[PDB]
Amino acid sequence: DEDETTALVCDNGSGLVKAGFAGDDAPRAVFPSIVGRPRHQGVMVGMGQKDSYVGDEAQSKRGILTLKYPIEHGIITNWDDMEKIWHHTFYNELRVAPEEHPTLLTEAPLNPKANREKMTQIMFETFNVPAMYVAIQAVLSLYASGRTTGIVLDSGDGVTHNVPIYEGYALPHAIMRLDLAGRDLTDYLMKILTERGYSFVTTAEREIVRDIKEKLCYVALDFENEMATAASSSSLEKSYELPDGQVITIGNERFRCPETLFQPSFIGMESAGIHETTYNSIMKCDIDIRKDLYANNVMSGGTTMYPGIADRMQKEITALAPSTMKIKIIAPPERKYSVWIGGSILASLSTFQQMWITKQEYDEAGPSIVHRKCF
Amino acid sequence: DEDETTALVCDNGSGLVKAGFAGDDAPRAVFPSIVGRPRHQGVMVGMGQKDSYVGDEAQSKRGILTLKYPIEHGIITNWDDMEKIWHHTFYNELRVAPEEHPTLLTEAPLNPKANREKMTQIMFETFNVPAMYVAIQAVLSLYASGRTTGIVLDSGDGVTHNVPIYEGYALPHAIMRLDLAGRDLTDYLMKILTERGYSFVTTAEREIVRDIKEKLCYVALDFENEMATAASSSSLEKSYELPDGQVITIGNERFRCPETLFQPSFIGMESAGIHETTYNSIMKCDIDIRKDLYANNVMSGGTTMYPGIADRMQKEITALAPSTMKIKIIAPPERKYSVWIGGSILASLSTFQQMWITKQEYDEAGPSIVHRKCF
Amino acid sequence: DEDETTALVCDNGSGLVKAGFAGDDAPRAVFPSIVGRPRHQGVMVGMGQKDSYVGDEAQSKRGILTLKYPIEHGIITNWDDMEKIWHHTFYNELRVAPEEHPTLLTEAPLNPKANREKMTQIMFETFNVPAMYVAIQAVLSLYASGRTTGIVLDSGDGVTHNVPIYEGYALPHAIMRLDLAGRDLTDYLMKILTERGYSFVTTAEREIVRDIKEKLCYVALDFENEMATAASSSSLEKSYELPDGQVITIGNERFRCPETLFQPSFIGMESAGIHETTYNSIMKCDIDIRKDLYANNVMSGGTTMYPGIADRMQKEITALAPSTMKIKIIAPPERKYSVWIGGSILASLSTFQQMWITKQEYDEAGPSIVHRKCF
Amino acid sequence: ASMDAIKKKMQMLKLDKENALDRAEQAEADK
Amino acid sequence: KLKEAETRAEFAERSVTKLEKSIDDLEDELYAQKLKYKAISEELDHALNDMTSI
Numbered sequence A, B, C: 001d002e003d004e005t006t007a008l009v010c011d012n013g014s015g016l017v018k019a020g021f022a023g024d025d026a027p028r029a030v031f032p033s034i035v036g037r038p039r040h041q042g043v044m045v046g047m048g049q050k051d052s053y054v055g056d057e058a059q060s061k062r063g064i065l066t067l068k069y070p071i072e073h074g075i076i077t078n079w080d081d082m083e084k085i086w087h088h089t090f091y092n093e094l095r096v097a098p099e100e101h102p103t104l105l106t107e108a109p110l111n112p113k114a115n116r117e118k119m120t121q122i123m124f125e126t127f128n129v130p131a132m133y134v135a136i137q138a139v140l141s142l143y144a145s146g147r148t149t150g151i152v153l154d155s156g157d158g159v160t161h162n163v164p165i166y167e168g169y170a171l172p173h174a175i176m177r178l179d180l181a182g183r184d185l186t187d188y189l190m191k192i193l194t195e196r197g198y199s200f201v202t203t204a205e206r207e208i209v210r211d212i213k214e215k216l217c218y219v220a221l222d223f224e225n226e227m228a229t230a231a232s233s234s235s236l237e238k239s240y241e242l243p244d245g246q247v248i249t250i251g252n253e254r255f256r257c258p259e260t261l262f263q264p265s266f267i268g269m270e271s272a273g274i275h276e277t278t279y280n281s282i283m284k285c286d287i288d289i290r291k292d293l294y295a296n297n298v299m300s301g302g303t304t305m306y307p308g309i310a311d312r313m314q315k316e317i318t319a320l321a322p323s324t325m326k327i328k329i330i331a332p333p334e335r336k337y338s339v340w341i342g343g344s345i346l347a348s349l350s351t352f353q354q355m356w357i358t359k360q361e362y363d364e365a366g367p368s369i370v371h372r373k374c375f
Numbered sequence D: 001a002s003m004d005a006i007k008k009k010m011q012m013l014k015l016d017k018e019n020a021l022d023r024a025e026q027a028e029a030d031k
Numbered sequence E: 001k002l003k004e005a006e007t008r009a010e011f012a013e014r015s016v017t018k019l020e021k022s023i024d025d026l027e028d029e030l031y032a033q034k035l036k037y038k039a040i041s042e043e044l045d046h047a048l049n050d051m052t053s054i
């Protein structure tokens, strides 16, 4: 299908998997990072039915499946389920076997080493990829956005890494890893929805709450004022259709879910929020770095698609940041897909052809080689 | 013409026994679950006269026989009479000996386990069947009806089981079994026909009422409005010919009997009826498995052949159901016989040839094997 | 009959309701949380006969009544039946007039708000109680158990709450709330008793199974070894006498019912089981919290009364827990009554007097006041 | 129909203000 | 066979009646949905013509 040995690129986290080939401007296919298994005893014979379901298969038949994510809080723990995901991710939908194509995968410097080691090891030992590279998602978001400098606040599914980069250099001492992410925002929402009479416990119920969140919730620019109205009037309530015909009406709960990003104490976290971490990543850097990082706060990844988040962050950051200086957010429509796009850009750069770990180097050094070669 | 060891299929209720061989689309013959015995003193001699009559023999000579049905609410208690029925069924009409063929018998999922153990034991120790398989009646209607998914409402002679099945899987926690069946409907009708001046008490009289019900009764869609006119005018009455040439004309009793299925309080049971049990089975299933069970209300067995029932059941579930959801009923002509048909389908599946208990496995394990091999 | 102008305490749930006055160490009486209504047509006249019966009245005359409870998995929906229960409980059984006494009612902290709002509203608007306080069941359990710290497993009729508390503080991010409870265990037992040949359908039949469960069921220390013998030999069977003189003999089913708490799949629930959810509540807490929660697994509510439950829970946690830590179950005689007792303690604490909502404050603020003063 | 007409008008006005703003900032920066 | 055919004829008359009702319900529901849906959402796109002006 490919007319060149183009690298394959995939952003595969605790949430979703985005994949396509280097040189495109988008993933060709997007899957959840899910492997599903039946939680019921079969009654009818000759029904087909798989032992395990992968990605979209797992969500489509979820009514009787338990759905697990092989990646949690930024790290792969279930390597077996990841092999099934990688095959589906790169071959079943793109029709490209990694054996003849280099592969670029993503993480962050505070992401435990086993993640980068298993990503590299699986593609080399199970898929026989000729080469590998592990990228920082912040690097890729900045390439996609047309920047070398900025803070990439990736507010994803299992972890927020908040990684500062200046003029193409990582500033790792200033990375603020926060135990608050989209999966926790889902948990908050089901607890507040329980307060309103709608309890969600099972896998199907969990996936529904994540759908409610993704389509109904918003950040807005001022939560105290938003709550003063949302808590007082039905005019800010929105109906969501549960896939059984029931309707759930969500009010100030509609923004109190994402509000956790500005109030982590809601889920038991000792933090003031993502704008505080953006501020601190910049603060930890020398002042001649800081001025450019404040002027280039970058949104990437998940949750960046909640209405009001790019503008709320600029307001919250300028409120912490020194005056006179211009504080600005970079938040293009190429948001959440900027990490994948940067992977395409990086994988295909002529100068990046010297940055790939080759299979021969891998076989000689072992799985730990990624720590010597990626960043 | 049986030159192949095809499995035999025999569905045995409190009402009728449907039997034929696997691979056909209908039972070859119906044995109406009966062993009849004379209740009078003989005076003439050299009259032949059996100690007991079986199946159609019991009905043909019923004028002086008491008719005993071996199965109560779908449970075989009089196993000796079932052996008489099975010998007659298999050898005289199907023209087969179970010794040369695998045999498939059926029962509701919550039917006490003793029943499935005896069905397995009898065919192996009395009939020397080379193999056995006790099937779920709900499953068999789904095969016959072209479904893998739906609520199967088996409103037959014995017990109404009501079991939700999704993608070929049982959802057993959502089974809503009712002690409401065709034999209670007949008793109710005998009492309300007594109110009209036609008392029915004894076996011959009981058989007449059962026949009246099957041919004259209906449910319609609105009981109270149907009653308002049935109780006011001869235009909703229907006449039935009694065996001795007398005629019984029946008015609102024509529907008051069938109505018991929707109003079980008519026979003293604390229940809301079959449409609420069907609805609750959908409700008790997971949130991502209800949008499919609403669209798949599946009929099984008899009473599904009452005029107005296909639409009343779809209507009652629709009335109980939330809006937005699509509610649909499956009520094929393969009614009152869909379970037998499913038995033929199941017995014959290539994927089912490993589900059969062989005689050697049975002899080594005993009757309890049915719970290890069938369900 | 009480000698002080004290507060009243009433732990009214989906199962049973316990009541007495604040300052005692036990409720005066426990009643089923039931309002009963006739399900039969009367024939004799001058027979008295109520439109509705409450508590002991509802159970005493149950032979001709259909019985309902007002609380659905911890949530009050039938506030009119709650009114009947509270009136009878306070007026006839505690022999007090709520108008002259503060009243304390209970609910899980994650219970939908309507529950706490109706408890506060009805006692103030229909009973004219001078003051109210909706209490947290986990708090009450710890006060009865002699603790400030631990995981409270109230494993009740409605819902299992499972909340970690440390030094008197809630740790809400770690509440592994679960929709698995005693009401499901009863329905499960009815289905498995049906498998053994003893069908149950009606309210009387349900009350009988509940009584069977409460006297015969147990958890055991090892489910697999217990079933290996119980399912193979009469030596572990125990009989129960049904009120009509029939005898039911129960084997491994005797423990399969409580086993459901550890194995939720038995009722179609997707859950790790009460011991793993307990483990996770401990593990979700900080390192300097975990050691104290391991040593303090705290029981309240029903189901904590099954023989072997305290010991199986301690074994399940120690088997998952790290070494060095001493894992302990707190399962005092105050079992099932831990919450009522705690209610008495809380209502009477001098440090709690300012926490009571007065009638004047209620009338000025309206029903929403419960969230300003209680929780 | 997506409000693309104003995603585009937004960009035009964004450019108009960004340019006016660039000038506001320069005009003050120039001292 | 006549009573059965009559049952079938009556069935079909009733089934037709049920479907006479359901066809009219679909004729009215399709009508109402179009009448309110394209009329409102197309109107909302007309409003786009104005909403997105400025």
Ligand SMILES: Nc1ncnc2c1ncn2[C@@H]1O[C@H](COP(=O)(O)OP(=O)(O)O)[C@@H](O)[C@H]1O
Pocket (backbone or CB within 6 Å): A011, A012, A013, A014, A015, A016, A137, A154, A155, A156, A157, A158, A182, A183, A210, A213, A214, A215, A300, A301, A302, A303, A304, A305, A306, A336, A339
């Ligand atoms: N409209 C939206 N509202 C809320 N969250 C969103 C929205 N769109 C995307 N996200 C979140 O994106 C997350 C996955 O983001 P991602 O950053 O790509 O993971 P990673 O980069 O670490 O591999 C999911 O939790 C999803 O809920």
Ligand SMILES: Nc1ncnc2c1ncn2[C@@H]1O[C@H](COP(=O)(O)OP(=O)(O)O)[C@@H](O)[C@H]1O
Pocket (backbone or CB within 6 Å): B011, B012, B013, B014, B015, B016, B017, B018, B155, B156, B157, B158, B182, B213, B214, B215, B217, B300, B301, B302, B303, B304, B305, B306, B336, B337, B339
């Ligand atoms: N037209 C009808 N009217 C009333 N009841 C019916 C009708 N057709 C079938 N049934 C009832 O259903 C029974 C046959 O259906 P079935 O479910 O296959 O019972 P079984 O368990 O014996 O196989 C008969 O007892 C009959 O009384």
Ligand SMILES: Nc1ncnc2c1ncn2[C@@H]1O[C@H](COP(=O)(O)OP(=O)(O)O)[C@@H](O)[C@H]1O
Pocket (backbone or CB within 6 Å): C011, C012, C013, C014, C015, C016, C017, C154, C155, C156, C157, C158, C182, C183, C210, C213, C214, C215, C300, C301, C302, C303, C304, C305, C306, C336, C337, C339
């Ligand atoms: N011997 C017993 N074994 C197990 N559970 C019991 C026993 N006795 C009573 N229970 C259970 O106690 C529950 C009611 O007590 P409780 O939990 O204190 O009410 P509440 O939920 O308001 O706290 C019922 O589910 C009942 O079945």
